[PDB]
Design a protein around this nucleic acid. Sequence first.
DNA 1: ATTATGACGCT
DNA 2: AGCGTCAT
Length: 430
Amino acid sequence: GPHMATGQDRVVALVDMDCFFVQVEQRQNPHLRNKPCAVVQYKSWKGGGIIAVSYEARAFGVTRSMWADDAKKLCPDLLLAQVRESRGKANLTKYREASVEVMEIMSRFAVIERASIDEAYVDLTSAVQERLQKLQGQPISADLLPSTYIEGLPQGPEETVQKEGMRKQGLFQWLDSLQIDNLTSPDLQLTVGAVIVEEMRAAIERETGFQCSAGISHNKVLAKLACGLNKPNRQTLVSHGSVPQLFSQMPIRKIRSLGGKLGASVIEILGIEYMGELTQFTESQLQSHFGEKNGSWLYAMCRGIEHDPVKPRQLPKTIGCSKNFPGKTALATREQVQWWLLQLAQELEERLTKDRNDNDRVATQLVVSIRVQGDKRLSSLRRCCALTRYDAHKMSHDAFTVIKNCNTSGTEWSPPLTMLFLCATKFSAS
DNA sequence: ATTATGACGCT
DNA sequence: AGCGTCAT
Ligand SMILES: Nc1ncnc2c1ncn2[C@H]1C[C@H](O)[C@@H](COP(=O)(O)NP(=O)(O)OP(=O)(O)O)O1
Ligand SMILES: [Mg+2]
Ligand SMILES: [Mg+2]
């Protein structure tokens, strides 16, 4: 009892931007603000593919992966913004630069781990300790947490007919219970972490004009889950004590890393649907079905416990460019293949050169991946070679050299390629 | 014809 | 080294 770890050692948050690519386009074009809007790529086929959707547009049922022509059927007044196109492919530079704006603000507060173009984990354990020392015995006011939800509250016994009324009542219950006394209560630490995350979210909105949501908990999985509970423009605190009720009706697929085959297996092999049901199995039983690492992870995670560290990494480990060639457009000639490789290499060269100037590093390996027609896998084949010069002509020529014997017969290229992907990796200081 | 592209585990 | 999974 006295010796059972409860996974309450850290304070971790996950900050994720709300409808991020849309906000980027709305900041730039004020006519799009506060309107049902989506961002699309490649307008020629079915009006383009939607990759981001404003919350006003979601209310009509518009979603990612939907065709714009189809989205317009659900939402006639839907406004659209097109992703920039360069060299015949989508160019996501505008969103990467916007991402940098936000990541640089978050880094001021604590160590972060970039997790995607629009989210990062934050390890607030040290910052909370410092803040706790800064205010001795200072009780925490509700005004310090104007956009925070406490998951699981309010509980027990009219302002609650509306959502802000629920939020405030739950926050009051939580704050009324908190003992400022006792610098080591995990609940107190989370609360101070939440205050700091309000400050962080305020700074991002002030300095970039972008709104975001956040989750604060004791580990990355719970912080990520918490982030999505009250999006948009709100933050949610998930305490250790909230986990049994929260996990009791939480579908297994909603937990990070369980959204694929492993999660399906868990459900299928154990005959359960919710994360909390995992507690009735022993660690050995879970290890026997899903392996040593997965079994141990599951046994601790269904109890709200996870030890994956927030890595101190702001910069991407790899830099890559890819393009799909669906259906009839699959590449069928040598020349075609070489031209598209050159286009990808030119974009890559730009991004690498910038990376070298900004971050004092150079990539040393080039990985080329291709997908052949009829193959469902992301990558049909991967090959690599040395990246010794940031030269687009050398890179595209070397990439062709490494995959040219994949061609069964021809001038002609077969089987046709439905994807080309160039990735620069193995960075070293410069 | 659900795209562009990341991190990282397994062998 | 090369492939498979899970992810936004
Ligand atoms: N499958 C995909 N393919 C291409 N781009 C994608 C993508 N999923 C996301 N993006 C791009 C476009 C997105 O804007 C961005 C962030 O991904 P989220 O955080 O998953 N989604 P958002 O921020 O939009 O809304 P909110 O978080 O409020 O739910 O990455
Ligand atoms: Mg987001
Ligand atoms: Mg995200």
